[PDB]
Design a protein around this ligand. Structure first.
Ligand SMILES: Cc1cc2c3c(c1C)C(C)(C)C[C@@H]([C@@H](F)Cc1ccccc1)N3c1c(nc(O)[nH]c1=O)N2C[C@H](O)[C@H](O)[C@H](O)COP(=O)(O)O
Ligand SMILES: Cc1cc2c3c(c1C)C(C)(C)C[C@@H]([C@@H](F)Cc1ccccc1)N3c1c(nc(O)[nH]c1=O)N2C[C@H](O)[C@H](O)[C@H](O)COP(=O)(O)O
Ligand SMILES: [K+]
Ligand SMILES: [K+]
Ligand SMILES: [K+]
Ligand SMILES: [K+]
Ligand SMILES: [Mn+2]
Ligand SMILES: [Mn+2]
Lengths: 500, 500
């Protein structure tokens, strides 16, 4: 099976890439696995594969940390992500995001049902497993539970059967046969839950699949449109129909090569304590537990020698930055274009803790609109902040064509020098806010509303006659022939490789 | 002479430090010297000493570029600056700024007059020099003149004789015997100029000394208080009285070891074209010339084998960041403390193009004030933005004790996650603005007023009961004994020096 279609093959690919460290001595799931992974993420090291996890029994489970985190070199910085998608390991962010967007104007390729797969190699019924006895990690010392679910895919379907959603949402062990987790608006798992709660007749049939096809977990982390079944979008993106097997205890379908599958229900009535969790902005508020959604597990199926992927998330850089931010930015780029806005590129700078998105403007097109900053900021912010794709993002930074939005240094330069505080900004208080940001849910104002801004880092002539400056930098302040002479004599004179 | 007291000795020190590249083949002052220096500054390379400058005659002149720029290693990042001050080359920013502030509660040590010095080795009267014939650099391709003055010290004295100011302000060659330059409020050269213009009787006696004692050029770049003679402040800082010689054509006094001295007058009546200049925010606006102040040169004196220091300024990182921003931040720290504000540290993040200052708050003291964000932001911003030390700074970011304001990554983290846009900010429109920032002088609003903000990145409990989070990072989310085990087994397991 190809790496992008089979998690087990993806793990091989990381090895082959010299991007894996296999740890075969005993490692404790209580903090140690996550501490090693945290260190990896903070230093862009190789992904850790914990083959000897204290508490692993009967095949459950090994852990792969940092599956979507960064590599140290510039040349293959995003290689782990490229390996989710069959792209060369040197792919740029633009190329990765374009791949993730490509299925948006293709016909879906619906999945293919097969009779069995590796995820059926082992099973545990409802008298044989106990989720408190598995080697579930404690990821951060102050977490409110052991977070089994940081990189699996929840599968729920609308009551009418017409939409099956795949998404990542956190969940922790509640007791031997239940989880609690986040299920919050406007997320699709919440939207589908609401449909079942209005029908009122039953709990939501559910599955949670860990170690799914890498291309599937990327779509699971992306805000593709309402009503769009991720499996068909991934099929179109990859050019292949995904192979799914039916659950044993319900009629949902899971990837055939899933490492571990939980089958059960998401309650339409019950809740239980959930959180706190150290997360994507870099914080944990010890003791802030809240009621979350409650899942009942009826069955586990799993591969021989199953591997659980884990995100040890928090401060830079991990999956909560590389995937959540970048994939939201991709969708925002498309949304803006579909609303006739002259946006060429979008990215969530890591330096902003993926709370900003920088939008690169085609300023030739802007000039033809014959508009002003106030009007344009309002239009952009109305489009983005009124849409689910904009949910996580609290500051949009508009930049002209000279800025590479994938380079945070350049975004910061433009923001700091081209956007006058106050005058060049529009605040949005009557939009949905993202409560997870500390200044929202632990801040001075409403946790769920407002706190958003469009910051215009377009200069005045960019709306009228064109850019009227040159940068005071080596690139722009010296002629080509001089630059090349400098470069060619650099080591000669006495001063100081692309791969490294 | 010690390095901090004599520029010629400072140049030796850089060599000795393996922090100099001597270029002994011909280099063109038309762009080439500045392009090499620009490249140095963008890559934190060794400082260039151009010993064979095309157009050098009769000893005028060699060029040293990048005198106050950064070194590549973390361990001696600020070593060039430390070498201006007799500090170890590993000194921290806190230590450098503390040294620069130390004279603020010491008695001045006034300078000592000596009969001669190296700056008198050669002279050119007013029939022997022509400033258009010297190898003055063109620093950026679009500059409006050849900027002779990027790292010398202007010397002007109040009409009553009681205040002699030393400061850096740019100036370019106008004709054979005149310069034009910036002389703008609230700068001390402007304040003294105004005193002479109100008296109305004569032009301002002036000298411009290049290659002055390094400790003197640091004070020249710092906003020490109105009325304070820099020479006595430097004397106190260094513990020694500076040796000065009298000018030949006026009664001002210049450092004895100055490399090059211009003597003449700053007009109280005349102006001439000045600029544009590629500068500290990273821009040049080709063609934006304005009238500037006009200087007449009557005499040149200089050392044998004189060296002119040059700042090839623009995008990160050069003297306009390391010195202007850091030294302003130092003064702001002191100002805040003298106004009873609980500020421990201040720094202008390079990532903000030195347009922000981050202020670290002693939150124990804040808690005892029993105040609120709105009130505290207003108080801080009134103090800073109403003072000359705050002139260049358009955003103040308040952070708690966990943030190291000298680390831009941490400032950006705090700003992005702890300050709710709008609600947690106070805009200041009725304060002096810094017109050099593009969004000011080339922006949508008044060039000289407003555009300032205090952004409060203190969390709510920091005002009341104390920090209520822990970071989701390796440092804070794992116990000490576990962290140390991870570190001690890191290379063992398979993962990857302080000087490198
Ligand atoms: C890659 C990734 C994604 C998420 C999450 C995680 C990772 C590693 C973690 C490690 C489990 C952390 C959390 C976390 F990142 C939480 C969060 C909540 C809302 C929006 C964005 C982020 N998690 C997650 C969460 N979303 C929650 O609702 N709920 C969640 O708990 N997302 C983001 C989510 O997968 C995307 O927003 C996706 O678009 C959802 O799919 P949908 O468009 O089909 O609803
Ligand atoms: C280190 C340094 C400092 C400056 C300047 C430069 C350097 C390398 C350059 C390369 C010549 C560029 C320019 C430039 F940075 C301009 C500027 C203008 C106002 C405030 C801050 C910065 N320059 C300069 C300028 N000031 C102008 O007015 N006028 C100036 O032209 N400063 C900053 C200045 O030295 C400090 O603001 C200092 O506090 C002034 O001394 P004072 O407090 O005694 O008035
Ligand atoms: K999704
Ligand atoms: K703007
Ligand atoms: K000064
Ligand atoms: K705040
Ligand atoms: Mn969806
Ligand atoms: Mn002064």
């Amino acid at each position: 099976q190809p790496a992008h279609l089979c998690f087990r093959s993806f793990v091989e690919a990381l090895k082959v890439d010299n991007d894996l460290v296999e740890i075969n001595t005993p490692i404790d799931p209580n903090l140690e696995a996550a501490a090693i992974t945290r260190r990896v993420c903070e230093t862009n090291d190789k992904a850790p594969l914990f083959n000897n996890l204290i508490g692993m029994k009967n095949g459950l489970f090994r852990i792969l940390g940092a599956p979507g985190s960064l590599r140290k070199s510039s040349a293959d910085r995003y290689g782990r992500l490229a390996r989710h998608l069959a792209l060369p390991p040197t792919a740029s962010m633009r190329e990765i995001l374009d791949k993730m967007l490509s299925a948006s104007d293709m016909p879906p390729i619906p999945p293919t049902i097969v009779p069995t797969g590796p995820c059926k190699e082992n099973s545990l019924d409802d008298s044989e497993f106990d989720l408190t006895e598995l080697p579930v990690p404690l990821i951060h010392k102050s977490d409110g539970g052991k977070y089994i679910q940081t990189y699996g895919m929840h599968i729920v379907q609308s009551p009418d059967g017409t939409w099956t959603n795949w998404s990542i949402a956190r969940a922790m062990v509640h007791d031997k046969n239940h989880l609690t987790g986040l299920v919050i608006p406007p997320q699709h798992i919440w939207q589908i839950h609401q449909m079942w709660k209005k029908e009122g007749r039953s709990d939501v049939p559910w599955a949670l699949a860990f170690g799914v096809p890498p291309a599937a977990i990327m779509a699971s982390s992306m805000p593709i449109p309402d009503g769009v079944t991720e499996a068909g979008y991934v099929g179109a993106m990859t050019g292949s129909s995904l192979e799914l097997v039916k659950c044993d205890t319900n009629d949902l379908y899971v990837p055939a090569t899933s490492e571990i599958v939980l089958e059960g229900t998401l309650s339409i009535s019950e809740t239980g304590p959930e959180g706190p969790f150290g997360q994507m902005h870099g914080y944990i508020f010890p003791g802030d537990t809240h009621l979350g959604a409650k899942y009942k597990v009826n069955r586990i199926t799993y591969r021989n020698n199953a591997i659980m992927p884990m995100s040890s998330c928090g401060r830079l850089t991990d999956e909560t930055h590389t995937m959540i931010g970048s994939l939201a930015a991709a969708e925002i780029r498309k949304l803006c274009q579909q609303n006739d806005l002259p946006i060429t590129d979008a990215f969530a700078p890591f330096e902003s803790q993926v709370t900003w998105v920088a939008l690169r403007v085609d300023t030739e097109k802007l000039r033809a609109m014959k508009t002003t900053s106030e009007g344009f900021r309002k239009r952009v912010g109305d489009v983005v902040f009124n849409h689910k794709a904009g949910y996580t993002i609290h500051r949009l930074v508009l930049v002209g064509d000279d800025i590479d939005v994938y380079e945070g240094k350049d975004v910061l330069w433009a923001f700091s020098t081209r956007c006058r505080p106050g005058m060049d900004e529009t605040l949005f208080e009557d939009v949905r806010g993202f409560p997870l940001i500390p200044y929202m849910g632990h801040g001075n104002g409403p946790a769920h509303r407002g706190g958003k801004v469009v910051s215009d880092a377009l200069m005045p002539t960019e709306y009228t006659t064109g850019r009227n400056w040159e940068a005071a930098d080596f690139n722009q302040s010296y002629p080509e022939d001089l630059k090349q002479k400098v470069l060619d004599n650099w080591t000669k004179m006495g001063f100081s490789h692309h791969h490294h």
